[PDB]
């Protein structure tokens, strides 16, 4: 409850698969404390017989002031070598998560679409996924938010 989110803006939208995530994250802090904030971005996939979750990047914002702080979290992109070919061209999900001394207190989930920029390539796919021609689209205008009450003290 001590920290809440005013906003998240996805500056790089739409973007390439390989393109990083720049997340302008407006947030607020009431009653400051020392142990510092762990902002984690987690890729979540769903494919044929698997439900894969892998962490993408993690930033630490320090020190934590009171009021409205706007910081940009630059996050590392996905790795097609570690993702099935279907999740390359399909809808996926990313969980921007912030945690306080081990304790996740807020989790913002976003739909994400991915597909080919080329017109024909979209009508008839290449035999192999060409990540260079994949383009991603974050549905950041409609966050899906989960909040967890952690012992801030």
């Amino acid at each position, epitope marked *: 409850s001590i920290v*809440s*989110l*005013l*906003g*998240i803006k996805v500056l790089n939208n739409p973007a390439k698969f390989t393109d990083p995530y720049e997340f302008e994250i407006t947030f607020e802090c009431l009653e400051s404390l020392k142990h510092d904030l762990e902002w984690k971005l987690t890729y*979540v996939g*769903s*494919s*044929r*017989s698997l*439900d894969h979750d892998q962490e993408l990047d993690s930033i630490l914002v320090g020190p934590v002031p009171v009021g409205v702080n706007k910081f940009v979290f630059s996050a590392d992109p996905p790795s097609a070598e570690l993702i099935p070919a279907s999740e390359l061209v*399909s*809808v*996926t*999900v990313i969980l921007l998560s912030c945690s306080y001394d081990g304790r996740e207190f807020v*989790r913002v*989930g976003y*739909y994400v*679409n991915n597909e080919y920029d080329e017109e024909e390539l979209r009508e008839n796919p290449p035999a192999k996924v060409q990540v260079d021609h994949i383009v991603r689209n974050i*549905l950041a*205008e*409609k*966050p*899906r*938010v*989960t*909040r967890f009450n952690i012992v801030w003290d």
Partner: antibody
Amino acid sequence: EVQLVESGGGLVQPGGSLRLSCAASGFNVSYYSIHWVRQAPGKGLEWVASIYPYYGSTSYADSVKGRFTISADTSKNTAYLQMNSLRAEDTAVYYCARGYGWALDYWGQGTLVTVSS
Amino acid sequence: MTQSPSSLSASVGDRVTITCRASQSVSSAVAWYQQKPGKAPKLLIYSASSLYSGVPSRFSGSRSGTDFTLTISSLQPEDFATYYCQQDGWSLITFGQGTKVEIKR
């Protein structure tokens, strides 16, 4: 304890305008996602409207398009399903509910909305 | 989207499975609710397989392709109700037609 209380139910004429109010307690609606779901007598659940947080931004069942406006006033910790051009098919118990990720963890008790001549 | 069976007779201790077929395969988008008459739905399972807090361990979920499934590993008297799958999809939220689980005698 977090509660959710609907209001503004009653009888309304076809083509009439009604406005429900989802009153919140235990939480501020600006951080959360808020939805309206309705249940005709002895029928399944039907979603009509979602308000998402941070940037307003809404989604509406195709049937209630343009006729319905979900919205929220954060000062007054409250949301509003606004129905215009109401038809006899929209008579039902209207639920309002908080988002839990992509689920709905807390619900009102509802109000009955009867539209008929 | 497509919920089967609309109706199920069963006894206490039995093992029940309801099945929902959605267009999307995103496990994050799917939950299940239980509703008794005159009462608001209660969440049971979120994001296909996660036990919502409070809910008993006899409830469980999973995804296989487009099909989602809730099972109750051994019915209880309090478990006789109607069940609904929810797909919180890209554009719009959908609910399955529902499944009413009545007692056999």
